[PDB]
Scaffold this active site. Structure first.
Site, PDB file in Angstrom:
ATOM      1  N   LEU A 106     -46.479  -5.806  93.733  1.00 37.54           N
ATOM      2  CA  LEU A 106     -46.854  -5.966  92.188  1.00 37.54           C
ATOM      3  C   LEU A 106     -46.834  -4.825  91.000  1.00 37.54           C
ATOM      4  O   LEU A 106     -46.651  -5.140  90.267  1.00 37.54           O
ATOM      5  CB  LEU A 106     -48.395  -6.474  92.168  1.00 37.54           C
ATOM      6  CG  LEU A 106     -48.805  -7.414  93.129  1.00 37.54           C
ATOM      7  CD1 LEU A 106     -50.430  -7.821  93.412  1.00 37.54           C
ATOM      8  CD2 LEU A 106     -48.648  -8.661  92.803  1.00 37.54           C
ATOM      9  N   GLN A 115     -46.610  -0.527  90.235  1.00 41.73           N
ATOM     10  CA  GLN A 115     -46.227   1.121  90.397  1.00 41.73           C
ATOM     11  C   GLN A 115     -46.954   1.861  89.100  1.00 41.73           C
ATOM     12  O   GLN A 115     -47.085   1.037  87.874  1.00 41.73           O
ATOM     13  CB  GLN A 115     -44.940   0.489  90.146  1.00 41.73           C
ATOM     14  CG  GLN A 115     -44.378   0.426  91.385  1.00 41.73           C
ATOM     15  CD  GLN A 115     -42.903   0.496  91.852  1.00 41.73           C
ATOM     16  OE1 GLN A 115     -41.920   0.182  90.572  1.00 41.73           O
ATOM     17  NE2 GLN A 115     -42.533   0.774  92.375  1.00 41.73           N
ATOM     18  N   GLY A 116     -47.276   2.783  89.791  1.00 48.66           N
ATOM     19  CA  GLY A 116     -48.062   3.261  89.442  1.00 48.66           C
ATOM     20  C   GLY A 116     -48.393   4.759  89.321  1.00 48.66           C
ATOM     21  O   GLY A 116     -48.727   6.014  88.885  1.00 48.66           O
ATOM     22  N   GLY A 131     -49.467   5.869  92.997  1.00 48.47           N
ATOM     23  CA  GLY A 131     -49.759   4.820  93.790  1.00 48.47           C
ATOM     24  C   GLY A 131     -48.787   3.534  93.083  1.00 48.47           C
ATOM     25  O   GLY A 131     -48.182   3.366  92.117  1.00 48.47           O
ATOM     26  N   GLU A 132     -49.435   2.637  94.407  1.00 40.87           N
ATOM     27  CA  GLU A 132     -48.582   1.543  94.229  1.00 40.87           C
ATOM     28  C   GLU A 132     -49.417   0.007  94.180  1.00 40.87           C
ATOM     29  O   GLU A 132     -51.112   0.501  94.583  1.00 40.87           O
ATOM     30  CB  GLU A 132     -47.130   1.558  95.165  1.00 40.87           C
ATOM     31  CG  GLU A 132     -45.819   2.238  94.945  1.00 40.87           C
ATOM     32  CD  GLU A 132     -45.116   1.987  95.842  1.00 40.87           C
ATOM     33  OE1 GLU A 132     -44.312   3.075  95.713  1.00 40.87           O
ATOM     34  OE2 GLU A 132     -45.208   1.303  97.125  1.00 40.87           O
ATOM     35  N   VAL A 133     -49.357  -1.062  94.963  1.00 42.40           N
ATOM     36  CA  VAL A 133     -50.206  -2.066  94.405  1.00 42.40           C
ATOM     37  C   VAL A 133     -48.845  -3.437  94.925  1.00 42.40           C
ATOM     38  O   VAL A 133     -48.038  -3.801  94.005  1.00 42.40           O
ATOM     39  CB  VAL A 133     -51.137  -2.979  92.673  1.00 42.40           C
ATOM     40  CG1 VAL A 133     -51.639  -3.554  93.683  1.00 42.40           C
ATOM     41  CG2 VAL A 133     -52.014  -1.484  92.375  1.00 42.40           C
ATOM     42  N   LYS A 181     -53.768  -1.688  97.556  1.00 41.52           N
ATOM     43  CA  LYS A 181     -53.429  -0.016  96.805  1.00 41.52           C
ATOM     44  C   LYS A 181     -52.305   0.628  97.299  1.00 41.52           C
ATOM     45  O   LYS A 181     -53.595   0.775  98.134  1.00 41.52           O
ATOM     46  CB  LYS A 181     -54.241  -0.558  95.495  1.00 41.52           C
ATOM     47  CG  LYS A 181     -54.197   0.997  94.573  1.00 41.52           C
ATOM     48  CD  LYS A 181     -55.866   1.411  93.995  1.00 41.52           C
ATOM     49  CE  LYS A 181     -55.885   0.307  92.653  1.00 41.52           C
ATOM     50  NZ  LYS A 181     -57.395   0.263  92.425  1.00 41.52           N
ATOM     51  N   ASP A 220     -65.363   2.490  82.095  1.00 38.19           N
ATOM     52  CA  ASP A 220     -64.016   2.286  81.691  1.00 38.19           C
ATOM     53  C   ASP A 220     -63.676   0.567  81.312  1.00 38.19           C
ATOM     54  O   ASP A 220     -62.269   0.512  82.280  1.00 38.19           O
ATOM     55  CB  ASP A 220     -62.530   3.171  82.754  1.00 38.19           C
ATOM     56  CG  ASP A 220     -61.158   2.534  82.438  1.00 38.19           C
ATOM     57  OD1 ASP A 220     -60.959   2.617  80.730  1.00 38.19           O
ATOM     58  OD2 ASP A 220     -60.383   2.898  82.713  1.00 38.19           O
TER      59      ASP A 220
HETATM   60  C1  LIG Z   1     -59.466  -3.812  95.910  1.00 38.96           C
HETATM   61  C2  LIG Z   1     -58.257  -3.627  95.042  1.00 38.96           C
HETATM   62  C3  LIG Z   1     -57.095  -3.410  96.039  1.00 38.96           C
HETATM   63  C4  LIG Z   1     -55.895  -3.662  95.300  1.00 38.96           C
HETATM   64  C5  LIG Z   1     -54.945  -3.293  94.446  1.00 38.96           C
HETATM   65  C6  LIG Z   1     -56.835  -4.010  92.899  1.00 38.96           C
HETATM   66  C7  LIG Z   1     -56.732  -3.515  91.814  1.00 38.96           C
HETATM   67  C8  LIG Z   1     -55.623  -4.775  91.547  1.00 38.96           C
HETATM   68  N1  LIG Z   1     -54.613  -3.992  90.236  1.00 38.96           N
HETATM   69  N2  LIG Z   1     -53.591  -5.275  90.754  1.00 38.96           N
HETATM   70  C9  LIG Z   1     -52.384  -5.322  89.718  1.00 38.96           C
HETATM   71  C10 LIG Z   1     -52.473  -6.141  88.829  1.00 38.96           C
HETATM   72  C11 LIG Z   1     -51.008  -5.106  90.501  1.00 38.96           C
HETATM   73  C12 LIG Z   1     -52.233  -4.218  88.646  1.00 38.96           C
HETATM   74  C13 LIG Z   1     -53.595  -6.438  90.905  1.00 38.96           C
HETATM   75  N3  LIG Z   1     -52.922  -7.245  91.387  1.00 38.96           N
HETATM   76  C14 LIG Z   1     -53.954  -8.608  92.175  1.00 38.96           C
HETATM   77  N4  LIG Z   1     -54.879  -8.686  92.952  1.00 38.96           N
HETATM   78  C15 LIG Z   1     -55.675  -7.278  92.670  1.00 38.96           C
HETATM   79  N5  LIG Z   1     -56.838  -6.565  93.028  1.00 38.96           N
HETATM   80  C16 LIG Z   1     -54.650  -6.070  91.819  1.00 38.96           C
HETATM   81  C17 LIG Z   1     -58.268  -3.623  94.076  1.00 38.96           C
END
Ligand SMILES: Cc1cccc(Cc2nn(C(C)(C)C)c3ncnc(N)c23)c1
Length: 241
Positions: free
Chosen positions: A10, A12-13, A14-16, A30, A113
């Site tokens: 999804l 990248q900062g 870590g990643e998701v 995450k 935040d």
């Molecule tokens: C608890 C949790 C786990 C994984 C990611 C997040 C934040 C998050 N961040 N992002 C992004 C938009 C990819 C940064 C998400 N996209 C879809 N669903 C999510 N839950 C997120 C929170």
């Protein structure tokens, strides 16, 4: 438990990642690059307008949670959808976030935040608070570290300008320093184009110098839920709002 399967990256900062828990439940994951307190908070806080924590992998997290198919609110407003959103949809989304923060408020917690980038969106314009910045931070918080639910209320006011501008950065043209010097001297963002003064008035209430004078998220929720009946019953669609 390690029953995860990462599919699509999804962000990248870590990643998701968009994955799948034990071959069924679709989830978001995450990841931390070695070089988490969020989970600790999401254990106590459970609300429909808050992103749900599912599981954790304390080895190598891997924080597993509710998948929100429309990414962050910031990206959503700046995306292709931004041009089609009107005040009704935006106010609605604001009400959902006030509902989540109302829960936070009752639980005696502080976000610290709150802002569009930290709000996630799903199907049917469902918005939820997640991720448990001078332009978004209340003066007393940025200056003296006075972080309270009232400083979150201030941040919500800024988030309102994000909704009504459809993603634009607050205090356009001003840098952090100018924003600090100006806001301290009583400066507040003007009424966004095509935004009813009634809503801008709500913002200004969130931006009051005295924290205790700012409204509660309960008041904010109720106000936004009833907006087009009690406040602007004569509302008519416009070019942008
Ligand atoms: C608890 C949790 C786990 C994984 C990611 C997040 C934040 C998050 N961040 N992002 C992004 C938009 C990819 C940064 C998400 N996209 C879809 N669903 C999510 N839950 C997120 C929170």
């Amino acid at each position: 438990r390690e029953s995860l399967r990462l599919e699509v990256k999804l962000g990248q900062g870590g990643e998701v990642w968009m994955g799948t828990w034990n071959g069924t439940t679709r989830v978001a994951i995450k990841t931390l690059k070695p070089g988490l307190q969020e989970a600790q908070v999401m254990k106590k806080l459970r609300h429909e307008k808050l992103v749900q924590l599912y599981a954790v992998v304390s080895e190598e997290i891997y924080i597993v949670g509710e998948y929100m198919s429309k990414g962050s609110l910031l990206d959503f407003l700046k995306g292709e959808m931004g041009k089609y959103l009107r005040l009704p949809q935006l106010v609605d989304m604001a009400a959902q976030i006030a509902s989540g923060m109302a829960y936070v408020e009752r639980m005696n917690y502080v976000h610290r935040d709150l802002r569009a980038a930290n709000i996630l969106v799903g199907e049917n314009l469902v918005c939820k608070v997640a991720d448990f910045p001078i332009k978004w931070t209340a003066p007393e918080a940025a200056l003296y570290g006075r972080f309270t639910i009232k400083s979150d209320v201030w941040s919500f006011g800024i988030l309102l300008t994000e909704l009504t501008t459809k993603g634009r950065v607050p205090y356009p043209g001003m840098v952090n320093r100018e924003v600090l010097d100006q806001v301290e001297r009583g400066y507040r963002m003007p009424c966004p184009p095509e935004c009813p003064e009634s809503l801008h008035d709500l913002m200004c209430q969130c931006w009051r110098k005295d924290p205790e004078e700012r409204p509660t998220f309960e008041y904010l929720q109720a106000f936004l839920e009833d907006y087009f009946t009690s406040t602007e019953p004569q509302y008519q669609p416009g070019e942008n709002l």
